[model samples]
Target: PRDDFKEAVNAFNPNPIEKWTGRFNTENASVRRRTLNVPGFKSIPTVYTEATLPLNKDVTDGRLTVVVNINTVQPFTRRTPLRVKREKWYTCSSSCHRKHDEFRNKCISEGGRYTTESSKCRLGEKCGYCKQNVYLATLYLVAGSVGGGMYRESDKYQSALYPFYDISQGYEPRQPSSVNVRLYSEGDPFIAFQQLTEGREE
Candidate 1:
């Protein structure tokens, strides 16, 4: 009875496949849901081939993995259903991707185990730091600080990590780019950006 939870994710696979989620449901449902999406293969496969692409446009891709490090989990004993406000794909910094490659190489040279298990993001292909760049809306987790509670809620909330997958489809090839982001709250992306980056975290 192989019950070890940390067994390798790819031991039973053939061709080089990325990790998504398990076929079964479990406790880490949200984590598994996000990890299963492919960065490069960001779109759903055709139902019949020859079909026009489905419109998945917005300020942020529905599939992007924003790593919000929640200082505290949600208060309710039961989890709420995930509400996806899908939007267009957005972009981040190409330079940030390049930077991570350099860091990855340096780490490998010094014998640091390389991993992108968080959301199963690929290092060079797709990662938190490399996936996109944006001027974020900072939220201090301290009490009575507006959205600071989210700082503890997580670092990936729009109040922290804002990623855009719009460029995932293609882009104008700018030197620097905005983070393709979706505001969970009913506000403008620019407004949300300003909202999160304000004040300090305790």
Candidate 2:
């Protein structure tokens, strides 16, 4: 029935599956990463989700989480004295690690506001989508050499007349357009983050 689960959901893939391409071993995502700000690491993100938690767990776990998970997604963040492994866990499976641990326990109860984006716009406010600013921060391009600026006509890149926001998915260009560069050397910048950006890669 249901035609073999609709032909394996139309043979898998609807989109999102990036998988950065460095030469790392245990598959990809740079083993989910670590060594940030540095110390020795007492704990880390064994596995929680919500974009891999951090940024000081957003003050009780909001603004995108990480007050703890610094161990870097290894065999469950190295597992030293963290015993909580009863195994099976699910309350709607880590809805961004339970809303970053309920906005970090509601900013430690009552006081609230652990994050809502502050810390002086901590690099676009961690994850709250750069508050009051919205987004767009100069990726202009399309004029000339970032290598002939990837040709949109190769007068060296006119950007097909500009309107921007063309985060690809448009297709067509590469025609009379010329400069098709795709270089990658010094490697492992998270393997060029899914080739630059798409859902912010990685």
Candidate 3:
């Protein structure tokens, strides 16, 4: 026996394709009706055959695939109303598209992975770091305070390690020009252009 239509015939709990309720004839010859719509299409052929374009400014072409099915039953039992399915190719609304691509790009910029199956994007960790030219300092006390004293009663610098986080990591801070003079302490005597030589009388 051919049960080719078995799935189509007995696939629903209450029969998705059709349904019948209430006592027949007890309700005095009841009649139930239902209608189904299926849409289909083909690619439109466009050519300027000297026809004036319509006044409607919005018009485009696309294809659509529509499948429709219908079935009926009454009296609760008689001949099993064979189900029939209709399908074909037809036109689809030109605006029947979605903005999945736009959403995907947005997710990507936010450090997320795009998923296609469910139109979902997985959000990942956001990263951050210290900026360049920004200085960070560290301090630690020395046992006796490391210092350098040159000549009689000289300037001193406290022992310390200075570290800075800078975006311009390749560069270091320094005087703009090497010829400029820098003094560490007021205790040292200033020298003139023709000052006497060190370790000798002036």
- Each candidate structure's TM-score, on Cα atoms with residue i matched to residue i, is 0.15, 0.16, 0.12
- Candidate 1 vs candidate 2: the lDDT winner is 1
Cα error, residue 155 of model 2, in Å, equals 13
- What is the TM-score (0 to 1) of candidate 2? 0.16
Candidate 3 weakest ten by summed lDDT: 44-53
Instruction: Give candidates' CA RMSD values in order.
Output: 20.1, 21.6, 45.5
Q: Judging by lDDT, tell me the better candidate of 1 and 3.
A: 1
lDDT for every model?
0.25, 0.22, 0.20
Clashes of 1: 26
lDDT of 3 by residue, 27-113 (tens): 211222222111221221111000111112112231111111111221111111011111211122232123335444544554444
Instruction: Note the clash tally of each candidate.
Output: 26, 14, 9
Model 3 C-alpha lDDT versus the unseen true structure:
0.20
Candidate 2: minimum summed lDDT over ten consecutive residues — where?
A: 76-85
CA lDDT, candidate 2, residue 37 = 21
